[PDB]
Amino acid sequence: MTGRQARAPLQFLPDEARSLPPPKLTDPRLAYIGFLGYCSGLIDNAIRRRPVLSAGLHRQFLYITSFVFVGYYLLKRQDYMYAVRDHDMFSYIKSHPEDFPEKDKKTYREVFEEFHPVR
Amino acid sequence: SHITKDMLPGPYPKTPEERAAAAKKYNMRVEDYEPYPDDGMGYGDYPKLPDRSQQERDPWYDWDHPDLRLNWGEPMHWDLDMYIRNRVDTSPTPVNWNLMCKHLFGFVAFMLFMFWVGETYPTYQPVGPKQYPYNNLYLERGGDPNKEPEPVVHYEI
Amino acid sequence: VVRDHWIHVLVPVGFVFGYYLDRKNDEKLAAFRNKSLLYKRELKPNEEVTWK
Amino acid sequence: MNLFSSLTLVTLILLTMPIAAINFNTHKFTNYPLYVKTTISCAFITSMIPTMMFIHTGQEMIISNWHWLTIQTLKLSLSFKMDFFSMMFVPVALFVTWSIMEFSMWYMHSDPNINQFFKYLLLFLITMLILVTANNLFQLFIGWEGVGIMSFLLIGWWYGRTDANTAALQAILYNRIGDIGFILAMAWFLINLNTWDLQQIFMLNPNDSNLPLMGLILAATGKSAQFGLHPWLPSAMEGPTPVSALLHSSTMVVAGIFLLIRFYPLTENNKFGQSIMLCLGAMTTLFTAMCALTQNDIKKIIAFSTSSQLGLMMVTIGINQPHLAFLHICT
Amino acid sequence: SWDKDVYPEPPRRTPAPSPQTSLPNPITYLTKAFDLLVDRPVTLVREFIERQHAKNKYYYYHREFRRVPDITECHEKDVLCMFEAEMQWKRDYKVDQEIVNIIQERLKACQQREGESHRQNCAKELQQFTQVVKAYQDRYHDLGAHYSARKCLAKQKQRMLAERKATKEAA
Amino acid sequence: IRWTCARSANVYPNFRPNTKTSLLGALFGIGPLIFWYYVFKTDRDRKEKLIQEGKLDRTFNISY
Amino acid sequence: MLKYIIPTMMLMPLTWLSKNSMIWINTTLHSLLISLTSLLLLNQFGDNSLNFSLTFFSDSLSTPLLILTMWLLPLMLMASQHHLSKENLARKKLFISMLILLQLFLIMTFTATELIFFYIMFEATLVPTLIIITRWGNQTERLNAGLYFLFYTLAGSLPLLVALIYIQNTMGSLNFLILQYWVQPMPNSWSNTFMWLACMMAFMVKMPLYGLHLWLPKAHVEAPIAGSMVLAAILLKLGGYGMMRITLLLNPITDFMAYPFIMLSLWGMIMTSSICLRQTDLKSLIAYSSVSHMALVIVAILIQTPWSYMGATALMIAHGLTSSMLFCLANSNYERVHSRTMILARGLQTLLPLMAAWWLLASLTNLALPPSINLIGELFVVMSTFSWSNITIILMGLNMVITALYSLYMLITTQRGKHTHHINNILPSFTRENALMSLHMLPLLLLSLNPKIILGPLY
Amino acid sequence: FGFSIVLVLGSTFVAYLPDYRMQEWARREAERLVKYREAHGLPLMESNCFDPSKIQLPED
């Protein structure tokens, strides 16, 4: 789905991204990114012949911090994009209400179907 | 270990070297080795045997595998799993085989024929039917307590 | 006293943590509390709940 | 009566203690044969009473409990009925097998695997009892395959001896032919009469009695060593001696025609079926008679004799006379 | 505890004994010895258990239901309507299964009481069994395994439409 | 070991597709299949047309 | 259920940060604790299934299979020693962690909300078993077996994804609840026939049916014991579970197009029972036994009676337990002699006396032990198929006869008749094998007592 | 931790628990409803499980 008002260049975090609730502490996706950072540092120590689970503790801390930071900004952009998709959808509903009629919601007392007996 | 030359790739041509290596690997006399031959039914180049081997191999030879009839070195039969005692008795019959099957089928046909002759010719005795008292057990047969009572009675003879 | 084996303690802690998270998920999905049409009553008898 | 039902249920339950007793032993027994002998004698002194109370009274009753799968319009419980033949047939089997306990004390006196032998033999008796008491036909099927596989084990008691396991394989194969006949009867009963329960079966007797009767004929020839399905009987005589005595004296040999006795209002009709009954039994009788001459193995001789007696009982089922056939079972 | 007006039984036609014997009667001596050596231990143990039940009281309660409206009053999608209607329908299905179970149990009891007089005293009960099973064979049977309720409703509409066509042709 | 390895793994070589082997294969694999398929055709058409007539033995036929 | 997923994530680093001679007891103990924890599962009642979250919901089809999976894990985790005791500690940790990850994707697979999640966890189930059998196959064609396995299961299971996205964008969301409420008959077009053939053919390949079962013998003769039991029990009965869930939609055309699968299933069941009657290599006999029983399962699925579904799930659970037990018996024989064949190791009534009890009991459970769950399943399937057709009982009973036959021959070939008196290296019967057999067969008899659990949602 | 605390405890857990499919509940419900319908004279299991007056059949 194309921009949609690139006037207003690429703008990694836009102005209206502060007009929506940001994600919070212990949300599961950033926790997944944090475990991904722990596994990143652990496997970094596993590349070279330095021992695993030791002697890379600042690398553990730096990789986990960096991934949580990056993933937090990515989550903010993600929720912005879904919100603007929602607003564009409902605004096109408002622009052409006539093209989308309410379907004939019959109750099942008057609905005829087929039966197709299995035996 | 296990050398690759103890498997069996390739068939029986050509006749010097294949029969030579078959006598090597199969521990057999050269003319005693026989290919099948190959007919697209797999089989490699596996030996053909005299194919009975279990009611043969008389028990007093006292070989090494007593309930297998092996010798620890044999061409084992390709269809050995059907041959063993407890599976198929390939004995020499006391009489024949064709005489056996023909007289058994003739006996079966005779007995069933006389059964059908009996089924058209029953026994019966100088006895009439049973004169049940109440409309042949009506209300103790199928019922109908108010549908159909019927007048029918026996007369004394 | 706990440091003799800190290994065997781990999986009941994991189970209790998952159970607490499932109860928090059920609190997040706490709609249609008395709005159902068959299992319906008021905020009664004690205090203002029908499941928690 | 609480007395009557209680005594029948304890004739069932007193053949449950010794198996779990030696499985809970973790010691070394000596007089476990004496223990099994005295508990079979106890079973007989319990089971002598309800037959006397029966012919004194009547009161022909059914018991049923511990239901499971009340799923669709049926439910099946552990359910058995004490009636005329199913009640007076128990003490005969108990007393006969008590004699076989004595004869097995003598016969297998010098072979120290006697404990596993008596466990198999007792479990075979229990399975045969659960067969002959039941009206819920799934319990009949339980006892049916159970006495088939205990027959397998008792024939193949002597491991080694290719005769034995050959024989046992033949016996179990012909009993699976009995099984396909019995499950065909079971399937017809379920689909047409909502259950396999002889109360409802004999309450609603249909006139189409052809497919279940053919299933009954196939179960009968699978069990009772009939023409074409006989030769596992001398093969079965290749087992040990009181094994063969119990296996083809009372138990396991009359159970095929026992079911046909049990279905007598179902086989009041369909004279085509009774014609097939008597013709088949006559075929068995004369075939094993002509085979029975010129044979020199005494076990096989008595096997041919009892095959002929089973043929006379098949004739006795063919004519509408089931109670003479049951009296022939006992004698 | 069971309602005899929903579990019917004929009363106890108890014949009086009549000897005409001088052996006399081993079974009477046996049943009096049975009562003396069996019933009183059973009575003592059951009375102790009955007092220990009489200590305090527990109470199991029948879960009671309303009537959520209908499946035919739900629309074509109505997701918070169909769920209520069809679980109520499933409970109707299972309780109707147990109706059929109860009637078939009564048939078995009528068979066993009368002995061999099957054509006596089992008339109304056989007839109501045939009635309920004709309703069941016509209503729930030939539809399949993934019923929800709507297959049964389609069967219902097609059944009454076939009968409407039948009476329209036969009138 | 030689008999086992010849019996299991040394079948697929050596193979050639002969016309007699192929016709015998297509007869021993497809013959009984189309035989039982024809008889299921037969029995199912008879039973379904019979219950479409409505003259089944469904006096009570619950356990389907 | 999330409280069943998250201790499995906690069970993985247990294996890592436990030390030498300390990983084993901790993993075994704690996975048995998880077996208790999901023995606590069965809250399911009445009208619906037990349904908790956008994430999770569990039927009583999924309930016994999930309990069976978590019960089969620690038994297996004890079963897979004696062939990696001499291997490395790190490679041992990799093995055990791969098993735990495989269990995790099994539970993920059984409690899927939408069928897309079911497919993702389906091929997630597919992937590590490959690594298990290829890294510890212990025979020269584990190459070919893993290659056949992955290619058949992908390339049969590949159009299933396309058909699921098509059902996604034609009928709204793919959750099983609303699809249970928004089904509608899709009549005899040809695209309906292709779509039905896609979904059913993918799960056909997973069962396997007779048409392409050829990966299954190599995948059991050329696999270690852990991957073999996981493969057979949980993967084949998972395929059956998946067909049970997807078959709710597409009702109107199955009368048109369900005939030939029934045909291939029945005739291939008979031919499979024929081909296992004669073969050597004892380990393969259980595999062809599995092919026969799952052909019976497939017949039970494609006929559509609640009797048939209850018998189907009974046969699922019963053959899972029986085949896993019998695999471990074959593994015990392969630990005794290094043969894998059938005619070499003979005797064994003298030697190992109570091992005979377990062989007898296993051949009884293959033999349809008369109150066992196996007989319940086979019996109700025969009932429903005799309702479906009055002539198919011939093939069912012929299957019954040959089933009894090959089970009995599997018994008496190995443990009857003569000890070969030249082997002389068997150790006596370990407590490990008897412990594993008591872990197998006591639950089977307990479920034989009160089988109202193991009957499915159409109870 | 496989037998003494798993096997027998799971055995006593599955030996009795609240009934699947509300089974004893269905028993008592069926007893109550059959006593109801036999008290009010009408036959038990009235067929046509939905209201035939409350149906809208599309005619021919």
Short mmCIF file of N, CA and C in Angstrom, two decimals, chain G residues 147-225:
data_model
loop_
_atom_site.label_atom_id
_atom_site.label_comp_id
_atom_site.label_asym_id
_atom_site.label_seq_id
_atom_site.Cartn_x
_atom_site.Cartn_y
_atom_site.Cartn_z
N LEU G 147 16.11 -38.21 3.68
CA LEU G 147 15.82 -37.51 2.43
C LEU G 147 14.41 -37.82 1.94
N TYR G 148 14.05 -39.12 1.91
CA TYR G 148 12.70 -39.54 1.57
C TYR G 148 11.67 -38.93 2.49
N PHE G 149 11.97 -38.92 3.79
CA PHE G 149 11.04 -38.41 4.79
C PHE G 149 10.73 -36.94 4.57
N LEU G 150 11.77 -36.12 4.43
CA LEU G 150 11.53 -34.68 4.33
C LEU G 150 10.88 -34.34 3.00
N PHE G 151 11.26 -35.04 1.92
CA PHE G 151 10.69 -34.69 0.63
C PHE G 151 9.25 -35.12 0.50
N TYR G 152 8.90 -36.32 0.99
CA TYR G 152 7.51 -36.73 0.97
C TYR G 152 6.65 -35.84 1.85
N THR G 153 7.13 -35.51 3.05
CA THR G 153 6.24 -34.81 3.96
C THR G 153 6.07 -33.35 3.56
N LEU G 154 7.13 -32.72 3.04
CA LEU G 154 6.96 -31.38 2.47
C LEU G 154 6.09 -31.42 1.21
N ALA G 155 6.51 -32.16 0.19
CA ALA G 155 5.85 -32.09 -1.11
C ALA G 155 4.46 -32.70 -1.12
N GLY G 156 4.07 -33.45 -0.10
CA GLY G 156 2.67 -33.77 0.06
C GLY G 156 2.00 -32.68 0.85
N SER G 157 2.70 -32.13 1.84
CA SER G 157 2.13 -31.15 2.74
C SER G 157 2.24 -29.73 2.22
N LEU G 158 2.70 -29.55 0.99
CA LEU G 158 2.91 -28.23 0.42
C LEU G 158 1.63 -27.53 -0.06
N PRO G 159 0.71 -28.14 -0.84
CA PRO G 159 -0.48 -27.39 -1.25
C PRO G 159 -1.47 -27.13 -0.13
N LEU G 160 -1.28 -27.78 1.02
CA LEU G 160 -2.12 -27.53 2.19
C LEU G 160 -2.07 -26.07 2.61
N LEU G 161 -0.88 -25.47 2.52
CA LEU G 161 -0.73 -24.06 2.89
C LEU G 161 -1.51 -23.16 1.94
N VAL G 162 -1.45 -23.45 0.64
CA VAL G 162 -2.17 -22.67 -0.36
C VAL G 162 -3.67 -22.78 -0.14
N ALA G 163 -4.15 -24.00 0.12
CA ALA G 163 -5.58 -24.20 0.35
C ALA G 163 -6.04 -23.53 1.64
N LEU G 164 -5.19 -23.48 2.66
CA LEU G 164 -5.58 -22.80 3.88
C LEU G 164 -5.64 -21.29 3.69
N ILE G 165 -4.72 -20.72 2.91
CA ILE G 165 -4.82 -19.29 2.63
C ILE G 165 -6.05 -19.01 1.77
N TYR G 166 -6.44 -19.97 0.93
CA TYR G 166 -7.63 -19.78 0.12
C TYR G 166 -8.90 -19.82 0.97
N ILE G 167 -8.94 -20.71 1.96
CA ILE G 167 -10.08 -20.73 2.87
C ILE G 167 -10.05 -19.52 3.79
N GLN G 168 -8.86 -18.98 4.06
CA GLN G 168 -8.75 -17.72 4.78
C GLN G 168 -9.41 -16.58 4.03
N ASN G 169 -9.04 -16.38 2.77
CA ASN G 169 -9.59 -15.24 2.07
C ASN G 169 -10.90 -15.55 1.34
N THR G 170 -11.53 -16.69 1.61
CA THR G 170 -12.90 -16.87 1.12
C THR G 170 -13.96 -16.93 2.21
N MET G 171 -13.59 -17.17 3.48
CA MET G 171 -14.60 -17.34 4.52
C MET G 171 -14.22 -16.67 5.83
N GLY G 172 -13.48 -15.57 5.77
CA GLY G 172 -13.08 -14.96 7.02
C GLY G 172 -11.99 -15.76 7.71
N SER G 173 -11.88 -15.56 9.02
CA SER G 173 -10.79 -16.10 9.81
C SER G 173 -10.85 -17.63 9.90
N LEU G 174 -9.71 -18.22 10.24
CA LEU G 174 -9.53 -19.66 10.20
C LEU G 174 -9.56 -20.30 11.57
N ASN G 175 -10.14 -19.64 12.56
CA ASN G 175 -10.26 -20.29 13.86
C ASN G 175 -11.33 -21.36 13.78
N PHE G 176 -11.08 -22.46 14.49
CA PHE G 176 -11.90 -23.66 14.38
C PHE G 176 -13.30 -23.47 14.95
N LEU G 177 -13.48 -22.49 15.83
CA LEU G 177 -14.79 -22.22 16.40
C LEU G 177 -15.72 -21.60 15.36
N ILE G 178 -15.27 -20.51 14.73
CA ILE G 178 -16.12 -19.82 13.77
C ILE G 178 -16.26 -20.64 12.50
N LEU G 179 -15.21 -21.37 12.12
CA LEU G 179 -15.33 -22.31 11.01
C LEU G 179 -16.28 -23.44 11.34
N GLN G 180 -16.38 -23.82 12.61
CA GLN G 180 -17.44 -24.73 13.01
C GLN G 180 -18.81 -24.08 12.85
N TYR G 181 -18.88 -22.76 13.01
CA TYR G 181 -20.16 -22.10 12.85
C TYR G 181 -20.40 -21.54 11.45
N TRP G 182 -19.36 -21.30 10.66
CA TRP G 182 -19.51 -20.74 9.33
C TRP G 182 -19.13 -21.72 8.23
N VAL G 183 -19.45 -22.98 8.41
CA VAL G 183 -19.30 -23.93 7.32
C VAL G 183 -20.52 -23.84 6.42
N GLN G 184 -20.33 -24.11 5.14
CA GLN G 184 -21.43 -24.18 4.19
C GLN G 184 -21.02 -25.11 3.07
N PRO G 185 -21.96 -25.86 2.49
CA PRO G 185 -21.59 -26.91 1.53
C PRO G 185 -21.05 -26.33 0.23
N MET G 186 -19.87 -26.79 -0.16
CA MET G 186 -19.22 -26.36 -1.38
C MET G 186 -19.39 -27.47 -2.41
N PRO G 187 -20.35 -27.37 -3.32
CA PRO G 187 -20.77 -28.54 -4.10
C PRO G 187 -19.81 -28.93 -5.21
N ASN G 188 -20.23 -29.88 -6.04
CA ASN G 188 -19.35 -30.55 -7.00
C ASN G 188 -19.01 -29.61 -8.15
N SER G 189 -18.02 -28.76 -7.91
CA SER G 189 -17.27 -28.14 -8.98
C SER G 189 -16.05 -29.02 -9.25
N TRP G 190 -15.07 -28.50 -9.97
CA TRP G 190 -13.80 -29.19 -10.01
C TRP G 190 -12.75 -28.56 -9.11
N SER G 191 -12.86 -27.25 -8.88
CA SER G 191 -11.94 -26.58 -7.96
C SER G 191 -12.15 -27.06 -6.53
N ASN G 192 -13.40 -27.35 -6.17
CA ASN G 192 -13.67 -27.96 -4.87
C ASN G 192 -13.01 -29.32 -4.76
N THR G 193 -13.00 -30.08 -5.86
CA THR G 193 -12.37 -31.39 -5.87
C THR G 193 -10.86 -31.27 -5.70
N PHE G 194 -10.24 -30.30 -6.39
CA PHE G 194 -8.80 -30.09 -6.22
C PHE G 194 -8.45 -29.62 -4.82
N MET G 195 -9.28 -28.76 -4.23
CA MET G 195 -8.96 -28.24 -2.90
C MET G 195 -9.09 -29.33 -1.84
N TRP G 196 -10.16 -30.13 -1.94
CA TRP G 196 -10.33 -31.26 -1.04
C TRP G 196 -9.21 -32.26 -1.20
N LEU G 197 -8.81 -32.53 -2.44
CA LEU G 197 -7.72 -33.47 -2.68
C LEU G 197 -6.41 -32.93 -2.16
N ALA G 198 -6.23 -31.61 -2.17
CA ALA G 198 -5.01 -31.00 -1.62
C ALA G 198 -4.91 -31.24 -0.12
N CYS G 199 -5.95 -30.84 0.62
CA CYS G 199 -5.91 -30.95 2.08
C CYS G 199 -5.84 -32.41 2.53
N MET G 200 -6.76 -33.23 2.01
CA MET G 200 -6.80 -34.62 2.39
C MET G 200 -5.57 -35.37 1.92
N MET G 201 -4.97 -34.97 0.79
CA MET G 201 -3.78 -35.65 0.30
C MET G 201 -2.57 -35.32 1.14
N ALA G 202 -2.47 -34.08 1.63
CA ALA G 202 -1.40 -33.72 2.55
C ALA G 202 -1.46 -34.57 3.82
N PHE G 203 -2.65 -34.72 4.38
CA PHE G 203 -2.68 -35.52 5.60
C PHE G 203 -2.61 -37.03 5.31
N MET G 204 -3.11 -37.48 4.15
CA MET G 204 -2.84 -38.82 3.64
C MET G 204 -1.36 -39.15 3.64
N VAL G 205 -0.55 -38.22 3.13
CA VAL G 205 0.90 -38.40 3.11
C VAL G 205 1.44 -38.46 4.52
N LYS G 206 0.84 -37.70 5.43
CA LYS G 206 1.33 -37.75 6.80
C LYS G 206 0.98 -39.07 7.52
N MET G 207 -0.07 -39.82 7.07
CA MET G 207 -0.53 -40.96 7.87
C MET G 207 0.47 -42.12 7.96
N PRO G 208 1.08 -42.63 6.87
CA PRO G 208 0.91 -42.56 5.42
C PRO G 208 -0.23 -43.47 5.01
N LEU G 209 -0.77 -43.29 3.82
CA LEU G 209 -1.64 -44.30 3.25
C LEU G 209 -0.76 -45.27 2.46
N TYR G 210 -1.39 -46.25 1.82
CA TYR G 210 -0.65 -47.28 1.12
C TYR G 210 0.06 -46.77 -0.13
N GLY G 211 -0.41 -45.67 -0.72
CA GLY G 211 0.12 -45.23 -2.00
C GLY G 211 1.56 -44.76 -1.93
N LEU G 212 1.94 -44.12 -0.83
CA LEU G 212 3.32 -43.66 -0.70
C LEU G 212 3.84 -43.88 0.71
N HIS G 213 3.58 -45.05 1.28
CA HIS G 213 4.07 -45.38 2.60
C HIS G 213 5.54 -45.76 2.63
N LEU G 214 6.25 -45.70 1.49
CA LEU G 214 7.56 -46.33 1.38
C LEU G 214 8.63 -45.63 2.21
N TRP G 215 8.40 -44.39 2.62
CA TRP G 215 9.37 -43.74 3.49
C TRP G 215 9.35 -44.34 4.89
N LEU G 216 8.19 -44.82 5.32
CA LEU G 216 7.97 -45.28 6.68
C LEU G 216 8.78 -46.52 7.10
N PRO G 217 9.05 -47.53 6.26
CA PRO G 217 9.91 -48.62 6.75
C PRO G 217 11.35 -48.22 6.95
N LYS G 218 11.90 -47.43 6.04
CA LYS G 218 13.28 -46.98 6.17
C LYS G 218 13.44 -46.05 7.36
N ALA G 219 12.43 -45.23 7.62
CA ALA G 219 12.42 -44.31 8.75
C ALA G 219 12.24 -45.00 10.09
N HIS G 220 11.97 -46.30 10.13
CA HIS G 220 11.97 -47.01 11.39
C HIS G 220 13.07 -48.05 11.51
N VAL G 221 13.60 -48.54 10.39
CA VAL G 221 14.75 -49.43 10.50
C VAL G 221 16.06 -48.65 10.56
N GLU G 222 16.05 -47.37 10.20
CA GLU G 222 17.26 -46.57 10.12
C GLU G 222 17.10 -45.31 10.95
N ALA G 223 16.67 -45.51 12.19
CA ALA G 223 16.43 -44.43 13.13
C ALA G 223 16.80 -44.94 14.51
N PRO G 224 17.16 -44.06 15.44
CA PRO G 224 17.33 -44.48 16.83
C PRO G 224 15.96 -44.63 17.47
N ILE G 225 15.96 -45.10 18.72
CA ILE G 225 14.70 -45.48 19.36
C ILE G 225 13.83 -44.27 19.67
#
